[PDB]
Write a protein that binds this ligand. Structure first.
Ligand code: ASP
Ligand code: ASP
Ligand code: ASP
Ligand code: ASP
Lengths: 326, 295, 302, 308
């Protein structure tokens, strides 16, 4: 059997309530050891060994935890045969994509969480973790980048997103679909991501204790320019617009961001719309203003890529060029 | 034949049918004054026609549709439509959508269902319909409860109607209003700044909607700031950037301690519409929370 | 607490938390896997619910998942009880890791005990969602979230034991239907034939040779038929056999006024009813009429 | 400009309404095609794809394999009803790795907002994109490139009906440009063991449906015809009504190859009789038919269903 290291960070998989019944619960309490215990079967498939990195609800996830995860994995890659990262569901699409862009290990790295608390009746965490270890222990999972395993499905870290607020089936790769499905502990992979991931990115976070400041602004009718101005007034390195439709902006937000782009702030057009690309060649002429189109990357994921891109280059043409490749 | 009025407002998209251009703006520039003008326009001319089709941009159609769904006091069908392909394109989708929207607006069965959106052969309710894809002609979906009806060969097979209140069942009248209360929206994500929330609070907004993570959750910075703002009188509604499902009560956030309002299935931009309207009546979060339980 | 009866039939009789929301009574009606469901269990279930309706406040039926969407629609059309009737099952074994059965059964009782669930027809409760008996269908082969109402959506979502209902089925059900199974020991014989390239007409013709009352076609696209199958079903309709055009395609209506001249042959267009669901309405249709027009009206109204 | 050959079989793209417009009428109605490809057009048949059959399939395989060297890519206009079957058949039998794109239309050409013209335009864009080669046989519909194996018709009327419901599309078309981000892993085209080049027949494979109370007469009818194979459209995870299973067990015992598939639109029929995997019944038929051209062993047929 392979050695699988479980790096715990918290989440509802690590949450507990007051009842098998009430929905009231608190995230990120139970330790990694109690999680492993709940799934004795793992020892049929892998020698697991858990490490508690943090124990938070991932609505409080941040750069420090990310850099800690990437470095730990990069450092211990030849000490283990693969990784499972227990994580909360809310920002798991952010961390999966961050690790997808920064981990230089091509051993399987697999994230997992739970939408029902461990104390819940019919809790989903035990079986999810079991299938995460299955995925991590499977040689065929290697070299497909960072993975998210939820609801019997292997999803790539770039395109996986949280689709529903409460459904156990919430995670879906809404643009290009999953990579493979898990049935009775076996995966039939029929796909792999074509965009560059893990060991093929230029991003090196070994010597990095902080990432460039990137904020997100939302677009809607009558939208105030005050959030955009605040991120400018503070001098963020980059700003991601959660636009309307195909990455469009409300007029006052556009004005603030068009000025900021001239004065060096990286500006990325993404979209609040849950699927489909923010393309070039539509209603916004990006080259004219020095904006970047985020492609299929939703706003929280475009932020991850823009942050990493700002450690390599200011140049809008180069940043766009990164968004066309990662 | 019935009389149907087409009120044009903009968009890629550009019975006895009568046509009128009220405004012409890309819907990404939609704003309070157009909404006020548009609701006033429809309430004034309701008696003069049998139904309205409103041609509109797709980017914020789900926002206008819900605003009208809450402010129109006319029970006659009001049917919004747009188009994802330019009208000069091969296989332009606008012509058939407008046709189907007039059919919907003329059908006696469409009445009393509130403001509707007709796209890609489907009749969708103003409350649940949202834009799910940035470019697909099939983008508009009612992602939580599904469509009201399907249209084939000019006939409608209606099998659903909204239980939440709309149109003439709402108390919201904007007839003598020239402004709406200021409501902004802030995004949550890992390591998020509270600067957006701080700026709107410092500007003394009437309300802030939180595009939360998962089941309406907030980054600790943003959540400290909004809890502080909620106690200082700023209305705060927890919504979710997650495209489907409700922000509920009784999950991780104890709303009653903080004075927060759970948005339910209303996404952030739709939650903003209802908050705005609720702030013309009450400002107590507990009275606002029932508002969000009925509309 | 409401009095709630649990009728077991099998699936994947005597979950402690059930006692906090209803006084639960059980009896084992039958004991089959639902891939083997049949007319006799449907008649039994319907007569059972109609006789005991006044002895209880509502019903929960445990059922296998494979044909739950068929029994739900049949009960939807034959149960004359307006009180809540809720079907539930599980996609993972009860001994499974993260078994879904316990929380599904809990939420079903929550639904059967909610007075707001009455007058909405027969209901399917799976994966925190309340689904109408007509539109609900199994969409994935293994997913716990398999059951969806794929044309018109759910009636409500269940959270923290509370149901926020926002919809109710417009089509007729329960006490608004003419179908009465109380007098019948058997149902008209209706079979289903599949369409695909180079499709054989042997399966349809075998049904005609056995003298079936009706035949449902799972057609291609908008109810279309391979040439030999349509020759075969044209011949059946000529001899008086009812023919309903449905579709193998998983969502959308089989419409009239399309590629097939239904009134010429006497065919019926199934609307959004998928093949196995159209068989239900046609069997019940045939207890009331054999006229193709009357049957089209029924597929339009229920 | 690339040389693109269009092979017309009919369908609503060429067809309440009645395949009757010619290939050259479809090509001539999209003059924009002249600015992306030199279009060459041939009429294989002109039928509704509800009437698609083995003969047309054998002819299309043979035409593409024979003329592969003479053009740069192929677009096959086709009815939408069985386009998902023809595409998988070609996916498994054409030995040409140049782009092969199938396309149809859900609205008649005279309909307003008719989807045909832009679909065809996008089909030719895709067939001219050299990046489309080595991806297998493709279906291009509603701005989306879909692998021939997973694509299926999901709605009876929707212009957006075609979807790769288990693993998703290969690419999206925006302003005449494809961003490919996936390719199929299961083997296809020149990587398959099947040669139909000298066949005028295919083995006989039928499909029987499962439901409550289900009659065994359709399966028996196919056992009585001596079919080479039967695909079961089972309930849930490939399960069978009792009486149908009894007859298929009889068929299997006497040499008929039996594949379990599912009437359920998404997800695999698992092992744990041949298990169909994510292949729906009409796709299972295609592969089973081809498998019976080289073996009758159930066990060797399963290996085939695990590779293609
Ligand atoms: N706090 C949320 C989100 C998270 O932990 O990521 C949960 O319970 O899952
Ligand atoms: N983006 C423009 C045009 C369109 O998408 O319809 C608008 O919303 O008005
Ligand atoms: N075995 C599955 C399917 C069935 O029994 O029909 C269940 O019990 O739910
Ligand atoms: N009956 C037609 C339907 C279509 O083309 O849309 C066909 O498949 O040929």
């Amino acid at each position: 059997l392979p050695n699988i290291t479980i790096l715990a960070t918290g989440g509802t998989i690590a949450g507990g309530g007051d009842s098998a019944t009430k929905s009231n619960y608190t995230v990120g309490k139970v330790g990694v050891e109690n999680l492993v215990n709940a799934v004795p079967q793992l020892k049929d498939i892998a020698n697991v060994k858990g490490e508690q990195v943090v124990n938070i609800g991932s609505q409080d996830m941040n750069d420090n935890v990310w850099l800690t995860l990437a470095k730990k994995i990069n450092t211990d890659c030849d000490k283990t045969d693969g990784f499972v990262i227990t994580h909360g569901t809310d920002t798991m699409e952010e961390t999966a994509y961050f690790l997808d862009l920064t981990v230089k290990c091509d051993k399987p790295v697999v994230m997992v969480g739970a939408m029902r608390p461990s104390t819940s009746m019919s809790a989903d965490g035990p079986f999810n973790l079991y299938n995460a270890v299955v995925t991590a222990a499977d040689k065929a999972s290697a070299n497909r980048g960072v993975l998210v395993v939820m609801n019997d499905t292997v999803l790539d870290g770039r395109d996986v997103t949280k689709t529903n607020t409460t459904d156990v089936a919430t995670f879906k790769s809404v643009n290009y679909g999953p990579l493979g499905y898990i049935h009775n502990g076996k995966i039939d992979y029929q796909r792999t991501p074509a965009r560059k991931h893990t060991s093929d990115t230029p991003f090196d976070v070994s010597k990095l204790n902080e990432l460039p400041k990137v904020g997100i602004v939302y677009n809607y009718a009558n939208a105030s320019d005050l959030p955009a101005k605040a991120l400018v007034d503070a001098g963020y390195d980059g700003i991601v617009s959660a636009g309307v439709g195909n990455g469009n902006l409300y007029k006052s937000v556009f004005d603030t961001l068009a000025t900021a782009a001239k004065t060096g702030t990286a500006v990325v057009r993404s979209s609040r719309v849950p699927t489909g690309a923010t393309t070039q060649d539509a209603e916004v002429d990006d080259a004219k203003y020095g904006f970047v189109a985020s492609g299929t990357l939703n706003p929280q994921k475009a932020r991850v890529l823009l942050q990493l891109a700002l450690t390599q280059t200011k140049d809008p043409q180069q940043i766009q060029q990164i968004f066309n490749q990662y």
